[PDB]
């Protein structure tokens, strides 16, 4: 029959960090020697060809203190 | 039949970082040597060819204290 | 049939970073030596080709404390 | 005949020398005391009381590179 | 005839010397005391009381890279 | 006839030498006391009271790399 | 008849009481340190840091003298 | 008849109490340190760090001199 | 007939009581250190760190002298 | 015969004191009871009669560093 | 016969006191009781009679660093 | 016969007192009780008579650094 829903999440969260110093972080990758020989390079569908490339990320957050909080409610 | 929905999500949160110093963060990738030989290069659909590239991200936020919150409610 | 919806999400939050100093953040990639050879190059749809390219991002926000809050409500 | 003289050099030569990358989180903080009726210093006396003296000499650290790409027919 | 002279050098040559990468988290913090009627120092005396000295010398640390690449028919 | 002279060098030549990578978590913290009527130093005296004096000399550490890629028909 | 009533009193009555005649040559001279992120005092807390607190209560020390020089014929 | 009533009193009556005549030559001189994230004091706490306190009480030290000197023929 | 009533009193009545005549040459001079995340005091705590707290209570020490020099013929 | 006298005293004297404090010096003498009975006091020559007297000196020099230096020379 | 007298007494002297403080110097003598009875007091020559006197000197010099020097020379 | 007298006494002297403070110097004598009795008192030459007398001296010089130098010379 009749419906009552009471939905009262209550959060008191301290998500913290207290870092004194981040030092001389060095990021220095090096590619060497790469060679490809062929009659064809022949790439059909969704091919990733990455020959001698470098992908480099230097992420240095002074705090990275991520919070995710997802809610839902449903009725029919 | 009646419906009552009372939806009072409460948050109190501290999402912090008391970072004292970020130092001499150095990012210096080096590409080396790369050499590709063929009669054809032939790329048809969604091909990513990266020969000898560098992709370089240097992300240094004094705080990256990311909060995501998400809500939904649905009725029929 | 009667419907009462009361929708009062509360947040009080401190999403902060008391960062003392950002140092000598250096970003210096170097592309090296690249060689590509063919009788033909033939690229069709959604092809990417990144021969010897540099992409560089240098992102240094004094705070990057991204908050997202998303809400929805729905009825039929 | 052909001669195809194509040497490749991608070398790196480096001298990281002195005081480098050291962290030094909070040196000091201790009490130091001297009490006297006389202090008397008179010839090439070096005196330090509670100092945090960082000092560095690098008369070295030098780099040398020589290459001689000679070719002759 | 052909001669294809293509040496490749990808060397790293490094000197890494003196004081490097040391953390030194919270040196000091200890009480030091000296008490007298006289302190009296008179020829080439080195005196240190409580000091957090870090003196460093590097007369060395050299690098020498030498190459010759002669070809002749 | 052909001569394909293609030496490849990937060498790492290194001198890591001195004081390296040490952690040094909380050096010190201990009491020191000296009491007198006189202290008296008069020719080449070295005197230390509660100091945490770190010191490093590197007159060595040199690198030499030599190559003679000679070719002759 | 004669009565020669001549009592002599040269008495001294004294209360030397409290802190008296103490010399106190150079109290103090020592380092004192407190370090924290929080200090929190909230009900009848008495706190002293390096103080040289001399204090003295003398609700006593009182003197009483009674004499009754009665004579009767 | 004669009565020669001449009592003599040369008494000294003394209370000498609390802290008296003490020399206290150079109290202190020693390093004291306290280190924390929190100090937290909440009901009738007495805290002392390095203090050269000298608190003194004298509720006592009283003197009472009573005399009667009756004569009768 | 005669009565020569001449009592002589030379008495010394004394209460020397408390802390008296002590020399106390150089009390202290020693290191003290405390390290924590928390100190937490919550009901009638007495806490002392390196203090040289001298203290003295004298509720006693009283003097009473009573005399009844009665004469009768 | 002929006379030469050379009289060269040479004095470099430090007579010192370095007193930090002189305390609560008390001087309190007390005479008691004294009685003399006689037919005569009869004093003829250089008599000192000192009956029940007090002679009191309270000398407290902050330094009392006395020097005496007496010289003479003579010829006939 | 000739006479030569050369009389060069030299003094250099420091006759000092670095006194920090002179305290509560108290001088309080008390005469008691004194009683002299006779048919005569009869004092003839150089008699000193002191009955019940007090002589009281309170000398408190911040320095009493007395120097006496004395010289003589004599010839006939 | 020839006489040469050369008379050069030299002094350089510091006769000092760096007195920091003179305190509560108290001088309080008290004469008590004295009784003298005779049929006669008879005093002749150079008699002194000091019955119940107080002599008091209170001498507190900030410095009393008395120097005497006395010289003489004589010939016949």
Numbering used by the authors:
A (entry chain C), B (entry chain A), C (entry chain E), J (entry chain H), K (entry chain G), L (entry chain I): 304 to 379
D (entry chain D), E (entry chain B), F (entry chain F), G (entry chain K), H (entry chain J), I (entry chain L): 306 to 378
Quoted passage from the original study:
Residues 297–391 (using the numbering of the longest human brain tau isoform) constitute the proteolytically stable core of paired helical filaments (PHFs) from the brains of individuals with Alzheimer’s disease. Here we use time-resolved cryogenic electron microscopy to study the in vitro assembly of recombinant truncated tau (amino acid residues 297–391) into paired helical filaments of Alzheimer’s disease or into filaments of chronic traumatic encephalopathy. At later time points, the first intermediate amyloid disappears and we observe many different intermediate amyloid filaments, with structures that depend on the reaction conditions. At the end of both assembly reactions, most intermediate amyloids disappear and filaments with the same ordered cores as those from human brains remain.
Again, most filaments comprised two protofilaments that packed against each other in various ways. Some filaments with three or four protofilaments also formed, including the previously described triple and quadruple helical filaments. As time progressed, filaments with two J-shaped protofilaments disappeared and filaments with two C-shaped protofilaments appeared. Among J-shaped and C-shaped protofilaments, the opposing β-strands comprising residues 305–320 and 365–380 hardly changed their conformation, confining all differences to the β-helix turn and its surrounding residues. The difference between the later J-shaped protofilament and the earliest C-shaped protofilaments coincided with a rearrangement of the 364PGGG367 motif on the opposite side of the protofilament. The formation of a tighter packing of residues near the 332PGGG335 motif in the C-shaped protofilaments compared to the J-shaped protofilaments may drive this conformational change. Finally, the change from earlier C-shaped protofilaments to the final, more closed, C-shaped protofilaments of PHFs involves a second inwards rotation of the β-helix turn, which again concurs with a rearrangement of the 332PGGG335 motif.
